Amino acid sequence: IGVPPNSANLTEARRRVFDFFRAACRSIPTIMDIYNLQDVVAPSQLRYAISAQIRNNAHITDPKVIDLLIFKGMEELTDIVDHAKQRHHIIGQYVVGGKTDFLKNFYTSNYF
Amino acid sequence: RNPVGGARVHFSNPEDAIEVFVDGYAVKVPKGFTVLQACEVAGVDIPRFCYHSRLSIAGNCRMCLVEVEKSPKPVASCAMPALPGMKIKTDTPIAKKAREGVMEFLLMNHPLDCPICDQGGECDLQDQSMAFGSDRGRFTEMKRSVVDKNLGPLVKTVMTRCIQCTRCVRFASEVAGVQDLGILGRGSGEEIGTYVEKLMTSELSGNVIDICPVGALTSKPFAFKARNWELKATETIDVSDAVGSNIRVDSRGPEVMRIIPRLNEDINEEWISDKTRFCYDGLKRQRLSDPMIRDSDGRFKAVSWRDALAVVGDIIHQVKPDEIVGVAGQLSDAESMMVLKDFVNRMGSDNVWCEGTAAGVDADLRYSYLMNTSISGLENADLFLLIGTQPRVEAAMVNARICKTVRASNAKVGYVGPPAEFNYDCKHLGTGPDTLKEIAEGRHPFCTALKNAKNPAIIVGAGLFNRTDKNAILSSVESIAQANNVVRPDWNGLNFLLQYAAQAAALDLGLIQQSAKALESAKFVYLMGADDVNVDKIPKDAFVVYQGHHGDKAVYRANVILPASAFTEKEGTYENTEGFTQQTVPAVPTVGDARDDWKIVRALSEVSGVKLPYNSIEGVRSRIKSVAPNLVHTDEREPAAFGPSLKPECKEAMSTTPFQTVVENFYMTNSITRASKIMAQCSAVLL
Amino acid sequence: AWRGSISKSMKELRILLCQSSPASAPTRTFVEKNYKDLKSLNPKLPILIRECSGVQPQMWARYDMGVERCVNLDGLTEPQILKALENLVKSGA
Amino acid sequence: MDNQFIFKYSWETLPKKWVKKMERSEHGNRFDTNTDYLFQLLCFLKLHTYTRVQVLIDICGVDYPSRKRRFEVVYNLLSTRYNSRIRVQTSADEVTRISSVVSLFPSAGWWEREVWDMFGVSFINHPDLRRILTDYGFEGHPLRKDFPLSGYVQVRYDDPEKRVVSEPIEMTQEFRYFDFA
Amino acid sequence: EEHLSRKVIIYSPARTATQSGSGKLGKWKINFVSTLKWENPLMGWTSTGDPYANVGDSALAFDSEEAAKSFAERHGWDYKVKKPNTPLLKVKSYSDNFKWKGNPQ
Amino acid sequence: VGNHTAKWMQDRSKKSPMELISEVPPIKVDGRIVACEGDTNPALGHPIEFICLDLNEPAICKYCGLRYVQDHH
Numbered sequence A: 001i002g003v004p005p006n007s008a009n010l011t012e013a014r015r016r017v018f019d020f021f022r023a024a025c026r027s028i029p030t031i032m033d034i035y036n037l038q039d040v041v042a043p044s045q046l047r048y049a050i051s052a053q054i055r056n057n058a059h060i061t062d063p064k065v066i067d068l069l070i071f072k073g074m075e076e077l078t079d080i081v082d083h084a085k086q087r088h089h090i091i092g093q094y095v096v097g098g099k100t101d102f103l104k105n106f107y108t109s110n111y112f
Numbered sequence B: 001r002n003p004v005g006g007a008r009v010h011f012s013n014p015e016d017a018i019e020v021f022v023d024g025y026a027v028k029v030p031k032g033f034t035v036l037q038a039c040e041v042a043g044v045d046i047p048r049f050c051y052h053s054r055l056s057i058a059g060n061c062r063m064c065l066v067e068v069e070k071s072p073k074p075v076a077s078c079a080m081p082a083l084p085g086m087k088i089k090t091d092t093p094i095a096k097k098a099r100e101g102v103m104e105f106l107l108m109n110h111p112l113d114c115p116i117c118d119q120g121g122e123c124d125l126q127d128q129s130m131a132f133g134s135d136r137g138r139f140t141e142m143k144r145s146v147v148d149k150n151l152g153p154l155v156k157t158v159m160t161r162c163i164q165c166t167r168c169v170r171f172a173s174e175v176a177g178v179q180d181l182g183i184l185g186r187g188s189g190e191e192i193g194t195y196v197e198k199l200m201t202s203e204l205s206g207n208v209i210d211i212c213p214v215g216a217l218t219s220k221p222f223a224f225k226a227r228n229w230e231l232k233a234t235e236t237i238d239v240s241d242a243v244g245s246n247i248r249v250d251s252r253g254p255e256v257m258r259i260i261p262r263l264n265e266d267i268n269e270e271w272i273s274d275k276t277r278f279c280y281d282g283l284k285r286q287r288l289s290d291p292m293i294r295d296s297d298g299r300f301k302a303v304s305w306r307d308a309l310a311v312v313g314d315i316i317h318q319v320k321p322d323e324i325v326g327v328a329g330q331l332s333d334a335e336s337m338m339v340l341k342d343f344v345n346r347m348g349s350d351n352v353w354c355e356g357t358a359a360g361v362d363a364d365l366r367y368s369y370l371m372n373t374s375i376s377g378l379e380n381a382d383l384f385l386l387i388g389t390q391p392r393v394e395a396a397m398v399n400a401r402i403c404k405t406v407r408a409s410n411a412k413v414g415y416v417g418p419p420a421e422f423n424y425d426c427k428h429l430g431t432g433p434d435t436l437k438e439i440a441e442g443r444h445p446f447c448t449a450l451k452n453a454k455n456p457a458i459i460v461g462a463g464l465f466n467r468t469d470k471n472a473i474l475s476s477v478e479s480i481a482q483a484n485n486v487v488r489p490d491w492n493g494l495n496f497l498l499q500y501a502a503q504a505a506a507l508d509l510g511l512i513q514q515s516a517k518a519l520e521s522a523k524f525v526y527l528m529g530a531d532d533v534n535v536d537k538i539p540k541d542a543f544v545v546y547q548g549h550h551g552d553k554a555v556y557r558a559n560v561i562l563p564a565s566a567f568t569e570k571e572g573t574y575e576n577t578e579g580f581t582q583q584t585v586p587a588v589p590t591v592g593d594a595r596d597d598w599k600i601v602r603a604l605s606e607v608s609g610v611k612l613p614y615n616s617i618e619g620v621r622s623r624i625k626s627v628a629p630n631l632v633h634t635d636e637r638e639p640a641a642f643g644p645s646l647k648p649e650c651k652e653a654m655s656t657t658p659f660q661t662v663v664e665n666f667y668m669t670n671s672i673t674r675a676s677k678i679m680a681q682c683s684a685v686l687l
Numbered sequence C: 001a002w003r004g005s006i007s008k009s010m011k012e013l014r015i016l017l018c019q020s021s022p023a024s025a026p027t028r029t030f031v032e033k034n035y036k037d038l039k040s041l042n043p044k045l046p047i048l049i050r051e052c053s054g055v056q057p058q059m060w061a062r063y064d065m066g067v068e069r070c071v072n073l074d075g076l077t078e079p080q081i082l083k084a085l086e087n088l089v090k091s092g093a
Numbered sequence D: 001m002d003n004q005f006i007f008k009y010s011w012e013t014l015p016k017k018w019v020k021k022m023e024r025s026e027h028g029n030r031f032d033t034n035t036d037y038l039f040q041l042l043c044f045l046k047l048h049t050y051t052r053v054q055v056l057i058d059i060c061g062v063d064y065p066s067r068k069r070r071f072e073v074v075y076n077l078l079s080t081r082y083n084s085r086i087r088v089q090t091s092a093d094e095v096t097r098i099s100s101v102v103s104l105f106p107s108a109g110w111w112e113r114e115v116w117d118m119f120g121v122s123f124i125n126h127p128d129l130r131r132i133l134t135d136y137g138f139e140g141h142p143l144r145k146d147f148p149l150s151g152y153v154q155v156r157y158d159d160p161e162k163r164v165v166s167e168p169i170e171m172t173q174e175f176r177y178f179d180f181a
Numbered sequence E: 001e002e003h004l005s006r007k008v009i010i011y012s013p014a015r016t017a018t019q020s021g022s023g024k025l026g027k028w029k030i031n032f033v034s035t036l037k038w039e040n041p042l043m044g045w046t047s048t049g050d051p052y053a054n055v056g057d058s059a060l061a062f063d064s065e066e067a068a069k070s071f072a073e074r075h076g077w078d079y080k081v082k083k084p085n086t087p088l089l090k091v092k093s094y095s096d097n098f099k100w101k102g103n104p105q
Numbered sequence F: 001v002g003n004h005t006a007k008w009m010q011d012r013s014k015k016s017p018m019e020l021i022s023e024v025p026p027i028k029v030d031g032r033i034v035a036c037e038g039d040t041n042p043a044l045g046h047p048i049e050f051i052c053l054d055l056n057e058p059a060i061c062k063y064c065g066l067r068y069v070q071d072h073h
């Protein structure tokens, strides 16, 4: 219940990473009901975004940083389920449901 | 302890140093330093008004008084030399009482003007009253009053505020070299003025605004417009000439409010010219905001970027490669010139050059177009020979360094060129290449003066570069340089003075005009900010595209207008006349639909079908590293490595045509200054 | 006779070097020894000698349509740099 | 029990490894300690007969961006028994969890939640550590010096969605910084 | 994320030329180059949408060059360092005002 | 009527303050100096301003715009 101490090693940290991913995935049906996503996105797409998020941070080697990321993820998930801030194609911070990029940026504005 | 302001102290020899005590603490200073300078090395800030490091000592304000042991009176530290074993006290009751008494006398007749005074909020008198003299005022009598004086359209005058420090008078005589300001009368009734009604005409006149510690001399175009606490400060460089004076740009929102000098001991030493100081008001007038193409009726209509680039891209493919010509403007950054050169070369053309006299010179060796003595190195020269150059209107801060050297070291100045008004002693040797022929052959008092010179300096203006006999003249000068041992491993006295901010980087990048007549045979002319090129030399059926932020004539002729950002809105690379590379810092947003110059040429190239290997300014600087790597090593002082010996011998004949003036109007030299109210008023009354 | 033909083969030749580094010593020797003759035989060909404090010695040639080729001059002697010039002149030009 | 007695008696009685810095001043007696000893030092001061520090007035964080451990956590404490105040400070960074003192002073619970909300410092064994002041789903820690004054997002009613929504901030007139130095 | 890839300039602001007092130097700043502002078409007020509009000048400060560099690199910003210019103290004498001009030439 | 006033004044019924202060005749002073406070009660006016009258043209108070002249010479 209380905030646990900082992880000793990457095995402890990974056990915690797996525990969080399990909790995040198990709440997916609750989210789908709250935001009425039955005709917007698939539950696996929600799972992919969560596992993606975790895979983008696979280069972290410091267990303290991993603990902070897990804590922030747990906080973010709790808000999404309890205090939903509904936006159409957006759940929290996740978008749900012949020329190079330079010329597009050039056409848009002078600030890239 | 860190010296005040982080100031550096140079020691000619450790043996030539003395020990003094500043508030008990022990400091070591060179022999000849004053008590005030010793206090700065100790890190103690002494209050001052009449003392300026770059002016002669006056010792009249009496605000720098400190206590010296065994001295019966308080000592003016600004004038008193430091002596070994001297014990200097600055916070004693004697020193504090002296400061309060002097500050009382200073405010006795000072007007209650802080609310209407532009110095308010950045005033040494305000700050020192709050700090040193915390006297409840007890002066109840009538204040004196003074009438205001007229000094022209740049310097507004409220002379009731003057504290008679004479900084302005000393600056006029010693730095500007124009003796117009004096102190008239005697006693409390003495007044700073010109006595007879005359305006301040020196091109360095605006610097009296910075040195006046009170609001007696202020900028008239900046009058009442802003308070210093609401201005964002940006440290950048000036592009009005080829000197690269360091400046601070003050802005409030999307608007430049004023330009004031920045300290750079190697270039401008906290001074700037009046063109640098007062050209800012042109940055918000007659700005090209949108891409325009001329209509059926021959009238410009605004369009989007996509339609404008499509038109230029389509029509560029309907001409032969040799008929494409690119001209870079005098305010072009190194990045945009590199992208322009790549774009034109990748279209099969070799007609890229920078506008101005140095359009088609030999850029093989870097000594041949740079001031090799360096600006700071001019102070060591004991003789100056100027050929085809008026530094006063061409490079004002370079001319300032010459005057300072002539005044201090008593250097001699020989001048060969059209008649001119110099602010220092200068013999007029002649007007054209005949005098060079006489100087080469000797039998002249200046020739034996040039021989008897330990460290002579020759300065040759870039204006002579556009002459038919440029190689004959260059060979004649390089022969004079050898005959008098001007170039040695300990003294490189051969100098070439550039006029345009873009000229040095253009020559480094290889933007050299190969065909001298490629402009009259061109059908696609790309004028990247080149407003000073003669546009009636272009064929009437040629497709001209003008890209810049201002313009008067090339805008009229152009078939397409591409709005570009100015130097205050972008991070661009510029190299000065001595080879020193610097970069501008963005201070304000860009107006309308404008874009950076390198972005426009890269965007056009993509539309035109050429793929340049870069998409960002970092990839452009990587490209530059392959051409002119000095322009990517910014703020690095590097000596030359090759000299005039490698130059193949020339046998061309000389043209009897006398040297022509390059700068006809000091205030009207670029498109920014041509769009400026103040510069127009300066041309009207200050010329 | 190839040294008198560098103008018909390339539009510009660039030689980058260091002023003081020992790695640039042969290239500096090459420039001081060869620049005079090369420029006299090719008066209209721009030969850009650009020195910088920390650049490995390089040598560049610009051809038609802006195609360029670079030769790394590190660990090379004066005659071999001359050969690197000749192959630039004779091949890809 | 004056500040002279506290400074001297704490020097004599406290274990030496706990306190790295002791400041006696009219602004307040201050004891700087390592994070691993903060909990034990606060339990000593609370239970010891000659100190009897029974009230935790508050806990606050201070951000020092120029420091390796940028956060300073300050514990203002009070002894009603001896009519004296004590300040105990410790330093922290963005990832190091420090010990919670809720088991010692129940009033610390909301103050530690505020520190986590405002600065991002986390507390080991805190029964319920979550943001307490900011809006739900808030990102960042506003009291950090690098957090912008006006934040990153703002809310408005959006009629097509029939709800209040959050979007990136657009300021009609910017905060004007008046540098008076 | 989005605001963590912007490139900044780390510099130490110079002394103002309108005052002879040196009491504002020694500080090190992080310049976010916030140059996207416009006029509100109701009152002419200056508008922005850039969150780092003034935090670089109002709140963030550093006492050393290293501290600013360390802060930038921890957040992931791409920084360029501009070293400050300093004055060179030179030997000055009041007696120089009355230097002899030498014999008439 | 001028450009400075037209930036804020959009009503032409009354005269602008620049017009109104121009119609107040210069005050004759016996002497070469006058002190202006902008009010009969000094505490309700502007900071006291001492104005020199040596010039022929009338001298303007920089705070309230009142004009002064030397009465005799």
Ligand code: SF4
Pocket: B110, B111, B112, B113, B114, B115, B117, B118, B119, B120, B121, B123, B124, B125, B126, B161, B213, B214, B215, B216
């Ligand atoms: S110079 Fe101006 S701001 Fe300074 S004390 Fe005098 S009136 Fe006030």
Ligand code: SF4
Pocket: B161, B162, B163, B164, B165, B166, B167, B168, B169, B192, B211, B212, B213, B214, B216, B217
């Ligand atoms: S006008 Fe300014 S600089 Fe000149 S003497 Fe008066 S106070 Fe000094």
Ligand code: FES
Pocket: B047, B048, B049, B050, B051, B058, B059, B060, B061, B062, B063, B064, B065, B076, B077, B078, B079
């Ligand atoms: S500063 Fe030394 S007397 Fe004015």
Ligand SMILES: [Zn+2]
Pocket: F036, F037, F038, F046, F049, F061, F062, F063, F064, F065, F066
């Ligand atoms: Zn008045």
